[PDB]
Design an enzyme around this catalytic site. Structure first.
Site, PDB file in Angstrom:
ATOM      1  N   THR A  14       0.838  -1.205   0.000  1.00 34.56           N
ATOM      2  CA  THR A  14       0.000   0.000   0.000  1.00 34.56           C
ATOM      3  C   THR A  14       0.872   1.255   0.000  1.00 34.56           C
ATOM      4  O   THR A  14       0.494   2.256  -0.642  1.00 34.56           O
ATOM      5  CB  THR A  14      -0.894  -0.026   1.236  1.00 34.56           C
ATOM      6  OG1 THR A  14      -1.746  -1.165   1.181  1.00 34.56           O
ATOM      7  CG2 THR A  14      -1.735   1.222   1.348  1.00 34.56           C
ATOM      8  N   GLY A  16       4.551   1.266  -0.250  1.00 33.96           N
ATOM      9  CA  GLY A  16       5.848   1.196  -0.945  1.00 33.96           C
ATOM     10  C   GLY A  16       6.167  -0.159  -1.538  1.00 33.96           C
ATOM     11  O   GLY A  16       5.461  -1.156  -1.256  1.00 33.96           O
ATOM     12  N   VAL A  17       7.221  -0.161  -2.339  1.00 35.44           N
ATOM     13  CA  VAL A  17       7.795  -1.327  -3.066  1.00 35.44           C
ATOM     14  C   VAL A  17       8.461  -2.272  -2.061  1.00 35.44           C
ATOM     15  O   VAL A  17       8.943  -1.790  -1.032  1.00 35.44           O
ATOM     16  CB  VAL A  17       8.825  -0.845  -4.106  1.00 35.44           C
ATOM     17  CG1 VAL A  17      10.117  -0.398  -3.427  1.00 35.44           C
ATOM     18  CG2 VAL A  17       9.106  -1.905  -5.156  1.00 35.44           C
ATOM     19  N   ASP A 120      -6.848  -3.683   7.326  1.00 32.05           N
ATOM     20  CA  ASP A 120      -6.829  -3.950   5.864  1.00 32.05           C
ATOM     21  C   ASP A 120      -6.445  -5.409   5.620  1.00 32.05           C
ATOM     22  O   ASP A 120      -5.643  -5.690   4.708  1.00 32.05           O
ATOM     23  CB  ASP A 120      -5.931  -2.968   5.112  1.00 32.05           C
ATOM     24  CG  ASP A 120      -6.280  -2.863   3.635  1.00 32.05           C
ATOM     25  OD1 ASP A 120      -7.369  -3.369   3.237  1.00 32.05           O
ATOM     26  OD2 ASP A 120      -5.456  -2.294   2.883  1.00 32.05           O
ATOM     27  N   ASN A 125      -2.292  -9.604   1.904  1.00 26.77           N
ATOM     28  CA  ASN A 125      -1.579  -9.035   3.078  1.00 26.77           C
ATOM     29  C   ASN A 125      -1.222 -10.157   4.052  1.00 26.77           C
ATOM     30  O   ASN A 125      -0.837  -9.859   5.174  1.00 26.77           O
ATOM     31  CB  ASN A 125      -2.420  -7.933   3.719  1.00 26.77           C
ATOM     32  CG  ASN A 125      -2.337  -6.644   2.930  1.00 26.77           C
ATOM     33  OD1 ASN A 125      -1.502  -6.522   2.041  1.00 26.77           O
ATOM     34  ND2 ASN A 125      -3.193  -5.686   3.244  1.00 26.77           N
TER      35      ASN A 125
END
Length: 287
Positions: A14, A16-17, A120, A125
């Protein structure tokens, strides 16, 4: 940074890489996340350094350098989204569904005991290893920044796993929001199909109503006083759960029903769910 060697990019979270990286000094193989930058983010991620549990991805270090926050995580094998996709024909076996649900409730109970919400939860995730453990990932900034509508890549943040108290615009979130999300994931693992694949806030809400019936003041005291509740909401009848998640056994349907309770104060806790008859024969198998 010039201390770790990136071996490959493995994801876009969400914020960053994420890179598979190798610590050049320790040979250590890590997951390296890089968030572009404020001070509140840094202080919030630091609290995560203490939130250690076998079912939470190990945060090894946090580096604030050059208007960037790097998080060094232990390295796991795949996300649950990939394993569910890979299994869409066969279906994940029940004991492994049961194992994973057990471990995630254990992770939530830990988090919720420390008044930390994920906010989330979703297959994207959750990380698995070859050892048959599953871990909570990509959370800890939600308390401070809430859940954005989009990622750093402008990808849509899925609504499929959002609790109805959020969608109806309650701005104070209980631990119950995570139990809803986990209920949605549970059903999806069984049926190999998203329970509530909404593409908008109101589409998400109406998918929920179509299956569970439109909430009223009886099932959910106060609901028609929710900020975004409209008396013009269509009134659907609750559907038989036997239809919803066949062929889940009675104990599964009963646990799921308690996980998808509309009233966040009646919704089963992580701790209660761990005592549910559904887990009486729980084991720990692997992919």
């Amino acid at each position: 940074m010039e201390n770790f060697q990136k071996v490959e990019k493995i994801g876009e979270g969400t914020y960053g890489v994420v890179y598979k990286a190798r610590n050049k000094l320790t040979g250590e193989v890590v997951a390296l996340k890089k968030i572009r930058l404020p001070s509140t983010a840094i202080r919030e991620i630091s609290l995560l350094k203490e939130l250690n549990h076998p079912n939470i991805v190990k945060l090894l270090d946090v580096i604030h350098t050059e208007n960037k926050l790097y998080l060094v995580f232990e390295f796991l094998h795949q996300d649950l989204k990939k394993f569910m996709d890979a299994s869409a024909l066969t279906g994940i076996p029940l004991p492994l569904i049961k194992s994973y649900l057990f471990q995630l409730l254990q992770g939530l109970a830990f988090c919720h005991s420390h008044r930390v919400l994920h906010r989330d939860l979703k297959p994207q995730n959750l990380l698995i290893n070859t050892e048959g453990a599953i871990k909570l990932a990509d959370f800890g900034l939600a308390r401070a920044f809430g859940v954005p509508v989009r990622t750093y890549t402008h990808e849509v943040v899925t609504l499929w796993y959002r609790a109805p108290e959020i969608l109806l615009g309650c701005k104070y979130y209980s631990t119950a929001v995570d139990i809803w999300s986990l209920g949605c994931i549970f059903a999806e693992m069984v049926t190999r199909r998203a329970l509530f694949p909404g593409d908008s806030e109101i589409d998400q809400l109406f998918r929920i109503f179509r299956t569970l019936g439109t909430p009223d003041e009886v099932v959910w005291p106060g609901v028609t006083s929710m900020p975004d509740y409209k008396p013009s909401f269509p009134k659907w009848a609750r559907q038989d759960f036997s239809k919803v998640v066949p062929p889940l056994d009675e104990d599964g349907r009963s646990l799921l029903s308690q996980m998808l309770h509309y009233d966040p104060n009646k919704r089963i806790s992580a701790k209660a769910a761990l005592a549910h008859p559904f887990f009486q024969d729980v084991t720990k198998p692997v992919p």
